[PDB]
Design an enzyme around this catalytic site. Structure first.
Site, PDB file in Angstrom:
ATOM      1  N   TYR A 186       0.835  -1.223   0.000  1.00  0.00           N
ATOM      2  CA  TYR A 186       0.000   0.000   0.000  1.00  0.00           C
ATOM      3  C   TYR A 186       0.865   1.267   0.000  1.00  0.00           C
ATOM      4  CZ  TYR A 186      -4.175   2.900   0.298  1.00  0.00           C
ATOM      5  OH  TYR A 186      -5.179   3.792  -0.001  1.00  0.00           O
TER       6      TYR A 186
HETATM    7 CA   LIG Z   1      -8.625   5.431  -2.157  1.00  0.00          CA
END
Ligand SMILES: [Ca+2]
Lengths: 619, 215
Positions: free
Chosen positions: A342
């Site tokens: 991420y």
């Molecule tokens: Ca988003």
């Protein structure tokens, strides 16, 4: 909470509705959990598909109905009565009732979630694990709970779309965090109120004052876009004000077979011609240089620190020439496709749980960096250079899977993330620093030398440069005639206009644009034509951008300063941690910004006066 | 008639501080000190102190008593030997830009002005420093010469009040009207000149070097 508690809760569950942030995340997560065995089905939205597949959750065989939303499902706005600009005074927007609603284009998605809730006994949120992702999750929860109010709601936490990550997410389902969702609802509300009140006030006023210049043009105000513009105007003004000064220095050079040695004056430089002329005259008569000190010590160049969003956004701009908006787009695409972790994190510390040895091993098939990755393993294993920050949610941005099938900028950013990761897990470059001090008529000059012994991390990270500066041999006590003894002139240089990486650095320093939102606000001031990019490519403020900043700043209160937004963003972080409630933050921030608004309306003529400098007269 | 007290004070001024004063100023000065302390008959020790305090506050330009040798500005290079109790009219640091100096003095914050994304290129300790060099505008009240911080003289600082009296002694090499002063050649006596505090204040000195108007 416990495995027994979860298994007990799951009893009698036959169908589990799973919802992702976008269809590609839904297709991806469903493909990995099912091992490609998933069966595609159609939703009421053509772009948001349903992927049914059998799975085992906490000792219960279920059918996973994996679908998606397309970002935020619900829109926030004032009631219809306050929506029209000529319907109310902008000041009332600080108290005007705000409602959440589903837009016409998303009604098909809302109706699909409602439809599937009827056939499902539980709901698992698979939105990205960030603040916006938790808020989207709560939008999905509200829609489904409207159908089944007693629906079992769970939350899947993951930092990558890989078979191990998504499988572990299913074995460790948690409760959805209302605290982080509330901080998003607070920010959304404050941004709408401060945004609307100040936008309507200035757009309507400046359109009446300068009709030929700002006709039908939107003069928008943002609680964060304004201090962002402020940094660009502040730097331009700094350059405008800067006074360059002539300085003088004695340059002594000594010629060698394959290179001239330049000895630098220990007095460095003087801002007085007579002061330097006197010292230089002393040097021309008796210029015999004597070697005073020949000193040498080990010097090292540090490998990069573990990568976070800010360092990626800045280094991609500086080193790869990709702007932060594009970097985050590509970074999200590589994340969704399972190649990187991420890319929205403040973490620069590798967690102890994370197996770096495997991540390095995985990169050994590459022709370019493969040999280096093997070299780390051969030298004992990965030794990362960690920072001091951890969001306690995500690890530093790193390659999660090897791919050689990328092209264009997607390849360039992946290659960068891989090389940075390997460089970080490597050793620091080790060299030898040498210095030779010479005396000419009691005046001391110094030549420096560098000899790199082990390049280490530099062999995989070409974005950093270290070069040998080999000096000839000088014996302590030697006497020699210098090639030239000069009295050269210099001038002080002003600062340069801000680059995007320079602007992000300032935003970071002052605590605005936090939660990886720097790019969004830089893009807004670009789009509204408040700033423009030079060929260099640096930020130059426009006349409207300039006039607004010096207009509000002339009102007394230092509004272009980021202190008020930094306080707002600080309060939002407190809401997430449960360290502050949403009602006090709202009451405090609204009172603070309503005061700044009331003062600005009172001194509104200052805005006219500041812009008149650029657009001339106007009524 | 204070000529008896004047010789005794003259002897002390030269013996203790190498201060040379004209006889007329000295007599006028003693008379004033006697009027100021009318109620008492002061000792020579107290008189000598109070005379010296008045000297420290006197503008040497208004004293018209030459101290420094004739044509010291006419000689391109040479050496100066002896004791001189001169006066600093103005003072400035030439090792630092006047714009940088005036900014810090004006207390304005220029932090964001030096922010860059480019990695910290750690400078050498004489680039991270470099050592200060004050350029003193010295006068005996008739001739004006320059005094350079050849070696670090910590007793001198840019905030010394214009009109500050300093003792310049020993062997001092000079070139193009600039004295190459070492710490062993300087002694700060003190004092100030009201008329000079106004015009040659550090803010005004630096503002002139960056071309600021109305000065
Ligand atoms: Ca988003």
């Amino acid at each position: 909470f416990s495995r027994a508690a979860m298994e007990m809760a799951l009893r009698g569950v036959r169908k589990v509705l799973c919802v992702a942030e976008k269809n590609d995340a839904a297709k991806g997560i469903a493909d990995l959990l099912s091992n490609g065995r998933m069966r595609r089905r159609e939703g009421l939205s053509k772009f948001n598909k349903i992927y049914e597949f059998d799975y085992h959750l906490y000792g219960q065989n279920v059918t996973m109905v994996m679908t998606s939303v397309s970002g935020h499902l619900l829109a926030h706005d004032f009631q219809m009565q306050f929506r029209k600009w000529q319907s109310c005074n902008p000041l009332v927007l600080f108290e005007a009732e705000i409602e959440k609603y589903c837009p016409e284009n998303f009604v098909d998605i809302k109706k699909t979630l409602e439809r599937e809730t009827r056939q499902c006994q539980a709901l698992v949120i698979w939105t990205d694990c960030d603040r916006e992702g938790e808020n989207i999750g709560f939008e999905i929860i509200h829609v489904c709970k409207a159908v089944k109010p007693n629906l079992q709601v769970l939350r899947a936490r993951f930092s990558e779309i890989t078979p191990h990550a998504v499988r572990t997410a299913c074995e460790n389902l948690t409760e959805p965090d209302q605290r982080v969702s509330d901080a998003v609802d607070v920010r959304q509300e404050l941004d709408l109120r401060i945004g609307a009140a100040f936008t309507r006030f200035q757009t309507l006023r400046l359109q009446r004052i300068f009709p030929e210049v700002l006709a039908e043009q939107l003069i928008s105000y943002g609680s964060c876009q304004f201090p962002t513009l402020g940094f660009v105007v502040e730097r331009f003004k700094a350059i405008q004000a800067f006074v360059p000064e002539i300085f003088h220095r004695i340059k002594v050079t000594h010629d060698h077979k394959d290179g001239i040695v330049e000895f630098n004056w220990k007095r460095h430089r003087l801002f007085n011609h007579t002061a330097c002329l006197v010292l230089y005259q002393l040097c021309v008569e008796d210029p015999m240089a004597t070697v005073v000190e020949v000193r040498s010590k080990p010097k090292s160049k540090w490998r990069p620190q573990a990568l976070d969003t800010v360092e990626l956004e800045k280094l991609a701009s500086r080193k790869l020439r990709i702007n932060a908006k594009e970097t985050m787009r590509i970074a999200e695409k590589l994340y969704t496709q399972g190649y990187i972790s991420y890319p929205r994190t403040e973490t620069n510390i590798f967690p102890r749980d994370l197996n770096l040895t495997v991540l390095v091993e995985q990169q050994t098939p590459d022709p370019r960096w493969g040999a280096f990755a093997q070299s780390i393993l051969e030298r004992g294993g990965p030794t990362p250079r960690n920072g001091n920050k951890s969001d306690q949610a995500h690890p530093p941005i790193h390659p999660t899977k090897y791919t050689n099938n990328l092209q264009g900028d997607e390849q360039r950013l992946y290659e960068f993330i891989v090389r940075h990761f390997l460089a970080c897990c490597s050793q620091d470059a080790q060299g030898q620093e040498t210095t030779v001090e010479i005396d000419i008529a009691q005046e001391r000059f110094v030549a420096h030398g560098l000899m790199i012994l082990a390049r280490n991390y530099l062999d995989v990270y070409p974005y950093d440069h270290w070069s040998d500066k080999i000096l000839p041999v000088y014996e302590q006590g030697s006497h020699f005639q210098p090639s030239t003894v000069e009295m050269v002139d210099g001038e002080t240089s002003p600062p340069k206009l801000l680059t995007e990486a320079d602007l992000i650095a300032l935003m970071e320093k002052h605590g605005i644009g936090t939660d990886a939102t720097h790019a969004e606000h830089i893009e807004t001031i670009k789009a509204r034509m408040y700033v423009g990019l030079t060929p260099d490519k640096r930020f130059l403020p426009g006349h409207l951008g300039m006039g607004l900043v010096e207009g509000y700043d002339s009102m007394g209160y230092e509004m272009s300063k980021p202190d008020l937004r930094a306080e707002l963003e600080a309060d939002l972080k407190l809401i997430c941690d449960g360290k502050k409630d949403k009602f006090v933050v709202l009451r405090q921030q609204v009172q603070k910004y309503k005061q700044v608004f009331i003062e600005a309306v009172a001194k509104a003529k200052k805005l006219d006066e500041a812009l008149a400098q650029y657009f001339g007269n106007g009524t | 008639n204070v000529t008896s007290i004047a010789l005794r004070a003259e002897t002390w001024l030269l013996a203790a501080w190498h201060v040379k004063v004209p006889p007329m100023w000295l007599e006028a000065c003693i008379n004033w000190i006697q009027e100021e302390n009318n109620n008492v008959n002061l000792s020579q020790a107290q008189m000598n102190k109070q005379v010296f305090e008045q000297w420290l506050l006197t503008d040497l330009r208004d004293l018209e008593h030459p101290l420094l040798p004739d044509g010291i500005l006419e000689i391109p290079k040479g050496e100066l030997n002896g004791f001189y109790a001169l006066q600093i009219n103005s003072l400035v640091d030439v090792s630092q830009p006047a714009y940088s100096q005036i900014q810090k003095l004006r207390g304005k914050n220029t932090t964001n002005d030096l922010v860059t994304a480019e990695a910290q290129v750690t400078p050498k300790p004489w680039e991270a420093k470099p050592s200060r060099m004050l350029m003193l505008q010295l006068t005996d009240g008739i001739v004006q010469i320059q005094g350079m911080e050849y070696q670090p003289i910590p007793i001198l600082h840019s905030d010394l009040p214009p009109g500050t009296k300093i003792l310049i002694y020993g062997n001092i090499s000079f070139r193009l009207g600039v004295l190459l002063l070492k710490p062993e050649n300087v002694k700060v006596l003190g004092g100030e000149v009201d008329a000079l505090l106004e015009e040659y204040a550090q803010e005004k000195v630096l503002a002139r070097l960056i071309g600021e108007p109305d000065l």
